[PDB]
Structure formats: C-alpha cells, structure tokens
C-alpha cells in the first residue's frame, strides 16, 4: 500500500518540503528530480519509474514523453479552470475575495488537464508568500492526500475542465509603484502581490529598484516619493495619502542580491536620520516594528519579524539587546516568537554575500547568533521558551533548541541541518543541545539526514516539546496558556531552583564554552580554509542561479546502488 512517487520541482521549496514530509511520514517513498533539463527529466522518470509524478513547483512544461507515460499531477495555485503562471499574483492584484488551489493532470495545453482535486479558501490581504505558505500549502496537502487515495482505489476518473480563463505572466509595468498616484492600500497590494518574487519595481530617490516587504504607516507623512525616515535599515516612503515602509529592495539588475533597503540605496541616504522605536515601547498607530516586546501574565514575549527568517549580524544584536532587556524584567518566562512566517533561518546569507569579505561577515554573523543563543542558555532564573509559528532552518532550528521548551504550530517544517550549504559544521550550541534532547546516536542520525522533518516528527523523536494550533493566533493563545499554567505551579519553582544550580556552576559554564569553541573552530575552517564549498553554495542560493544537477540525497534515482 506504499507508493513510489517522483517530485519534479524547480527548486526544493517550502511547498515541496512540506509535501515530502506528509508523504514520507505516511511510508511512501518520494524521490526528487530538480528541474534541470528536459532530457534529465525524461531520464529521471525512466530511471525511477514512479507510480505517480507530482510537480509541486514548476516553471516550464514537462516533456510529453514523461507525462504521456507516467501519471503526472501538477499543482496550480488557482481554482479550477484558472490557467497561467501567476495565478496568485493576479488574485492579489485583482483583490479576489475567494481563491483556491487545483491539482490537475499534465496536458499539452498549459494548465488544461483534467482536475483531480481542488480546495478553495478566503483570501487575506497579505504577502503572496504568506498566502502560498499557509492557505495554498494546506490546500495542496489536502488535494495530494486525496489524490493518493483516489490513485490506489483504481477506478478514479478526473473531471475535465469546463469554463477556463487565462491570466498572463504579469509584467513589471503592472507591479510598478507610482508614489504619486498610489495610495498606501495600492502600494501594499502591489508589493504583496510581488513578495517574495519578483518584487515590485519602482523608482526610489531617482533610483530603479525592486520593492519587498511593505508595511503601512499611519503617523509619518511627507512628499509622495520622498524617504521620510530610516529604521533598522527599512525606509519609509510617502504615498499619495500616507506613508509606507519598505524593509528590503534589490537593484533592478540581473543576479543582484535582495538586501535591506539601506544597503541598496547606500549614499542616496546621506542625511536621512533614524526614527528608532525600542521594542518595549508602546504606540497607538500602525508603523514598522521589526522586534516587539510585550508582557502578559508574567510572560515576556519577544516577537522578531526578520524578513525570510534570515538574521543578519545587526539583527542578532537587536534581538540580543531585547533579550537582555527581558531578563531584567519581572517576568517568570521569556518567549521567543519569531514571526508568523518564520521562526528563524539562521544567518543572513544575503548580507553575508554582499559584504566586502563574505568570510568576515560570516564570522561576525555566526558569533552574533551564538551570542543570542548563549544569552538564552545563561538564564538561570527564568523559563525560556521558543514558539515556532513558522518554519525553521539551519541555525534557526538550533536557536530554538537553546530554549528550555520548544513548541511548534501544526504544519511547521524544520530543516535541522547545515550540510545542504556545502559542509557547514554549524554552531548555535547544537553540540550541547541536540544530544541533551535526543542523544548522540539519534542526534547524528537526524543531522546526517539532509531532508526536512515535520514538527510532528520532531515531537515524536523528542526534538521539540509539543505541536498544536492551526493558525498563528491559535498557536500563540494555546502557548500562552500552557506557559501561564506552568509558571503558577510547584513544578516551576522546583525547576528554577534546579536550573539555578546547574547554570551557575563552573562545570556547566565551561562545558558551554567548550561547545562554542569546538563549533567555532570548525566553522572557522568552513569560512577561511581550503574547502570553499560553503561560499560557492551561498553564491548560487543568494543569486537565484539555476540548478545544474540534482544531488543524490534528493534524487534516489541518481544513486549508485539504485535498483
């Protein structure tokens, strides 16, 4: 009753990773062929001979010789009959109240195959990636699981399409932000529809950029088109009726790096000064707050909204400062909440690659993230909690594991490994935390494994402490109650006195230092040594270079002993 399934993915992205967990944790075998070349895709199908092919994320036609021979199902992020490559972009730009996803057969005509499954859902006014990672992904899981049952039943007939409409690839003239004709609702709509690819073109300070990650501004006003303010490298720009923050941009030039706005504009920003708001301040108006600290019921909650979960060196220090502020407050627990889209993805490879010496910036970034980790570990008199509302990868996973307790929302996917970025040893105290949670035997096993694992699986194997909630609000609410209940019990004071004993002794303190030394000595080699596979992987990832091979850890069918 177990299927052999082949994924064709342009990139092994968040949706492909979630489907991989859902299918393999039901004891199907999934092999992945990245979309490298049509002849390689033909070979992959003939090698693997799947029962079923699923294309979760595809950027071009599947060769007829594949899908005429192997049942091939295609994910389309629009409701049935919707066709074309930017379904979600158009739904956001048109303001569709209701949207959907459709699982359909490959066909000669684009998006014209018979329908196997579909779901619909109400839209949010939100980033396309947010819709994609939540409503679309959850819709797609449901569709795929349904089609797996249908496939194994045996007499299923898909439903041919009836009405159909075509939306083209959306041109940048459509996305383009005109600061004088566009109110804030319109700017948000265009950036949302273009986030996190391909960005909304615009002219800022007479400079051509792509705009990512917008936020409204009810307070500051100014000339439409002028930079009103700076804040944690985000710029505030006047709109036809208000203002809007733009945290990230990139130069409108091929293979340019997406970066915080201040690092793109550069010396166009002489003179513009900061408008800081410390995360523990309260305001009554909508603005942009990267980090937010809020106290409730004896709990200090640290939200940190780092774009794509990447923590640059400076962002790490802002978080370290907020943690240190929280540890001086009269709270029994401190909770790291990340953002709704990501808990954390470790070091910011984009700021690293953009530095004059990526090696040097990697050294600053990994020491800064370790400093955050070490601050959390050295908290003897408070409960520490990591609350993963969204996915976590690389250092981000292990930042969480420094907390006393780790909880994840349902549907969260973890990537608790580094070697996919060419041989990184990793740090973030993983050599102290992972064996403490799971033992070395089980520990080496998961980090040698290079594939994602669900928060459910992480829970089963003891990597995290619980999974619950379907939405971020529901998760935060149930988390707040679990913590509130604990910090008002005997087990809390027992716990704290035991934790105070451990983390004030010189033994534990030097065991902690020696783990950091060991990890950073290996990380020094990754960064400065003869082997440069980390810097090479970084280059292709950050620059969105296409793949030239599928490595064997993804492609079962490209392995030696493969029979």
Residue numbers in the entry: -1 to 561
Text lifted from the article:
The crystallographic analyses reveal that HypX consists of the N- and C-terminal domains that are structurally homologous to the hydrolase domain of FDH and enoyl-CoA hydratase/isomerase (ECH/ECI), respectively. HypX will catalyze two consecutive reactions, the formyl-group transfer from N10-formyl-THF to CoA and decarbonylation of formyl-CoA, in the N- and C-terminal domains, respectively, to produce CO. The putative catalytic residues, His74, Asp80, and Asp109 in the N-terminal domain and Ty416 and Glu426 in the C-terminal domain, are perfectly conserved among HypX homologs listed in the previous report. CoA is constitutively bound in HypX, which will act as the prosthetic group for CO biosynthesis through the formation and the decarbonylation of formyl-CoA. CO produced by HypX is used as a ligand of the iron in the NiFe(CN)2(CO) center of NiFe hydrogenases.
Here we examined whether the extended conformation of CoA was also available in HypX and found that CoA is able to adopt the extended conformation in the A392F-I419F variant. Ala392 and Ile419 are located near the cysteamine moiety of the folded form of CoA, whose positions correspond to “a neck of a bottle” accommodating the pantetheine moiety of CoA in the folded form. Replacing Ala392 and Ile419 with Phe will narrow “the neck of a bottle”, which will destabilize the folded conformation of CoA by a steric hindrance. We solved the crystal structure of the A392F-I419F variant at a resolution of 2.3 Å. Though the electron density of a part of the pantetheine moiety was not observed clearly, that of the ADP moiety was clearly observed, by which we were able to identify the conformation of CoA in this variant. In this structure, the relative orientation between the adenosine and pantetheine moieties of CoA is different from that in wild-type HypX though the position of the adenosine moiety is the same as wild-type.
